[PDB]
């Protein structure tokens, strides 16, 4: 205990095709469905999974490999053991292999710019693996947003945070049991903003940790070089396990670079080709 425990996230990128018609949003929830980075994981933390029809494709077609799932957050309070804490939904969902007795949504209380719009939140799942408890946060932050300074953004991330650590706070959760805390928390490896994080959350950086990596890089996603080709790349997206509660012996994060099949979209007389699942790359969290 925890093992041999393996934790995918994936920020998808489906967003609403009411507003955004041609991102190949259906196609790609079969496509990553089907992706062998998908597979063999005890849990997934989706972000991003706002489209009504393409994210309930997605949820779908991973029940063959995670049966036990919660809904995404911010639709409602169907499904959910509890709801605390808008154009549309969070865009975070869990699935898992494992059971999950107890699962609840909390709504974040401050937001700002574009993101006023969706009810961004976090998921908290508690699954039994074979005897074991195993407690996961799946979570999907505030972005920074041309019209909110970037003090403005921060600030809000912040407030998020603390969100969480009230709320596992008030779990009361016992400190021989895991949590992990996981999704695009938004937050640019190696920055003060970094620093902070690991301070709000409680939490400490995977093992041997390599941020030369970029979880979001318009240098080599297909996907970014149409929309934002001149950004900098950045790392936003981690799978965390809280300090005051138990540890492996190592935790680690990989991100996965792994291309798509090619697929194709028409706007208007043109075809645009890709080759990504999504604008980010997905994150593996593991023990060693």
């Given at each position: 205990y925890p093992g041999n425990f393996k934790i995918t996230s994936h920020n998808v990128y489906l967003f609403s095709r009411n507003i955004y018609p041609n991102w190949g949003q259906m196609h790609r929830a079969d496509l990553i469905a089907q992706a062998d980075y998908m597979k063999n994981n005890d849990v997934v933390i989706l972000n991003e999974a706002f489209d009504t029809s393409a994210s309930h494709r997605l949820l779908n077609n991973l029940r063959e490999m995670y049966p036990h799932q919660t809904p995404v957050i911010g639709r409602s309070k169907h499904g959910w053991d509890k709801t605390e804490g808008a154009l549309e939904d969070g865009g975070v969902a869990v699935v898992s292999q494992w059971p999950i007795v107890e699962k609840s949504q909390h709504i974040f209380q401050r937001g700002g710019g574009a993101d006023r719009l969706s009810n961004k939140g976090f998921a908290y799942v508690k699954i039994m693996k074979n005897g074991k408890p195993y407690h996961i946060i799946g979570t999907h932050t505030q972005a920074d947003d041309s019209l909110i300074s970037k003090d403005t953004s921060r600030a809000i991330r912040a407030e998020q945070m603390q969100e969480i650590q009230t709320?596992?706070?008030?779990?009361?959760?016992?400190?021989?049991?895991?949590?992990?805390?996981?999704?695009?928390?938004?937050?640019?490896?190696?920055?003060?903003?970094?620093?902070?994080?690991?301070?709000?959350?409680?939490?400490?950086?995977?093992?041997?940790?390599?941020?030369?990596?970029?979880?979001?890089?318009?240098?080599?996603?297909?996907?970014?070089?149409?929309?934002?080709?001149?950004a900098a790349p950045e790392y936003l997206d981690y799978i965390f396990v809280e300090n005051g509660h138990a540890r492996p012996h190592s935790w680690h994060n990989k991100v996965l670079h792994t291309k798509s099949p090619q697929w194709s979209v028409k706007s208007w007389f043109k075809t645009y080709t890709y080759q990504d699942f999504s604008d980010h790359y997905p994150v593996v969290g593991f023990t060693d």
């Amino acid at each position: 205990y925890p093992g041999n425990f393996k934790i995918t996230s994936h920020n998808v990128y489906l967003f609403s095709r009411n507003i955004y018609p041609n991102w190949g949003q259906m196609h790609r929830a079969d496509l990553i469905a089907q992706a062998d980075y998908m597979k063999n994981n005890d849990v997934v933390i989706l972000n991003e999974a706002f489209d009504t029809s393409a994210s309930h494709r997605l949820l779908n077609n991973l029940r063959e490999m995670y049966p036990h799932q919660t809904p995404v957050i911010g639709r409602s309070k169907h499904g959910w053991d509890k709801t605390e804490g808008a154009l549309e939904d969070g865009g975070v969902a869990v699935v898992s292999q494992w059971p999950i007795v107890e699962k609840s949504q909390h709504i974040f209380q401050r937001g700002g710019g574009a993101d006023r719009l969706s009810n961004k939140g976090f998921a908290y799942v508690k699954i039994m693996k074979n005897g074991k408890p195993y407690h996961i946060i799946g979570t999907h932050t505030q972005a920074d947003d041309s019209l909110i300074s970037k003090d403005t953004s921060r600030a809000i991330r912040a407030e998020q945070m603390q969100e969480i650590q009230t709320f596992i706070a008030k779990k009361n959760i016992p400190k021989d049991e895991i949590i992990f805390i996981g999704g695009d928390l938004n937050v640019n490896y190696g920055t003060d903003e970094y620093h902070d994080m690991l301070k709000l959350l409680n939490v400490s950086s995977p093992a041997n940790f390599n941020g030369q990596m970029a979880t979001w890089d318009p240098t080599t996603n297909s996907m970014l070089k149409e929309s934002y080709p001149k950004a900098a790349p950045e790392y936003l997206d981690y799978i965390f396990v809280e300090n005051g509660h138990a540890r492996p012996h190592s935790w680690h994060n990989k991100v996965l670079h792994t291309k798509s099949p090619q697929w194709s979209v028409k706007s208007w007389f043109k075809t645009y080709t890709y080759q990504d699942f999504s604008d980010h790359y997905p994150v593996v969290g593991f023990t060693d």
